[model samples]
Target: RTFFVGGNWKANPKTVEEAEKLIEMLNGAKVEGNVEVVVAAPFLFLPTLQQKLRKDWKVSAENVFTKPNGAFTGEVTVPMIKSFGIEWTILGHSERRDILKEDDEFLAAKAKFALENGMKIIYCCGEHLSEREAGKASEFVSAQIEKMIPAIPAGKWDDVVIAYEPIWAIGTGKVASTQDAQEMCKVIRDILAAKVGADIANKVRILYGGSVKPNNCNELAACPDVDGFLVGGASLEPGFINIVNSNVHSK
Candidate 1:
């Protein structure tokens, strides 16, 4: 599989001009090796991102509502995104699950709706600090994957990519070691093989998120099960090019 890199600019820049500048910087980047690049920004900024970003790269939504349309206040639905020609989104991100209190069912519904509506997804799942501390990381993460398994529509695995973002590692500046990242990614891949099928497991891309920066990206990219990254803070800086280019090492 070609490496996939997603730049999740989570509620960043705070202004359209700043967003435009980031895009300008990204536009000037010299991407190398084989990679699928998706830059996910807030819904309000997605239109500008799509318009000004490199055509070869894609724009993604950070989140979406479950239904195509509804009275759900402040919720952006799948159709609304698709109408903007956006082809990707991130679902079940750690921030949404923790701060916003989004449950598994809600995330599964969002995945199903987005896939059914023809949008590709970067679906996330992982354990918190407590689970990791107790050495039950596998059990906790497996349950999350199991909850997501049935929600994927038949044949939609083609449109889905999984990201293992240990909640404790997210933005904490304490990234999981290369070993830890590979282990969790392998665990998720195994779960897919067992619950779904081997073909799906091989075809699916499992990404590692949390504290991924240029300094450590190469080592993580060298990992067998680490397909790519769902980058955060680093995505805004020039180092993001290093992260995107890390695919060269993976090859």
Candidate 2:
């Protein structure tokens, strides 16, 4: 698996100027080793990001509607996004799950729609704090993945990237230990292997998210199962370069 890092700038910067400035910073980053990089921004900024950001690195939408088009006010559809030449999107992020009330069925629909439309996806899944404390993290996360499994069309697993973002850790400055990251990723891989087949599971990239910073990125990257990251806040800063380059640490 190629190391993959997706920078999710979730509802941030508050201005197009700041967004442009960030693009400039990312454009100048010198990545080391091989890594597939995608930066996901709000819908409004995607055009600028697609137009001006480095072409080598792809631009992604934070989310997308489950339709081709029409009558869905305030909803961005797959066709509209595809028309922009954009090819990637993020679905089922914890923030969307909690804040927008995006349930598994809804996200599964979005995943199916996106994949059927020729778009790649970064699918997020994880357990809440209560589930983690109860030592049921694996069981809870497995249920989320099980729901997502049927939505992925056969032969489309290459276009799917799974991200494990513990709800309690996201944006909270609490990074999961390296062991935790590896174990969860391994769990996800096993789920894919059992449900989809080992061939697809071995090729899929499973990432770890939740307050991933430059200070800890190397250690996390070194884990056998951590293929890369779905970075949040750090993605907005220069430290993102470090996180991206940390791909060299992966086996």
Computed on alpha carbons, the lDDT of every model, listed in order, comes to: 0.91, 0.93
Candidate 2 residue pairs that clash: none
Taking every candidate in turn, the Cα RMSD to the unseen true structure, in Å, is 1.2, 1.3
Off by over 4 Å in 2: 171-175
lDDT of 2 by residue, 1-251 (tens): 99999999999879999999999999999999999999999999999999999989999999999989889899999998989999999999999999999999999999999999999999999998778778899899999999999999988999999999978665555556789889999999998889888999999999998669999999999999999999999999999999999999999
- In model 1, how large is the Cα lDDT of residue 56? 94
lDDT of 1 at 34: 88
What's model 2's lDDT at 157?
93
Candidate 1 residue-wise lDDT, 120-214, digit = tens? 99999999887888899989999999988888889999889999997876555555788999999999999889989999999999999867998
The parts of candidate 1 lying over 4 Å away from their true place are 170-175
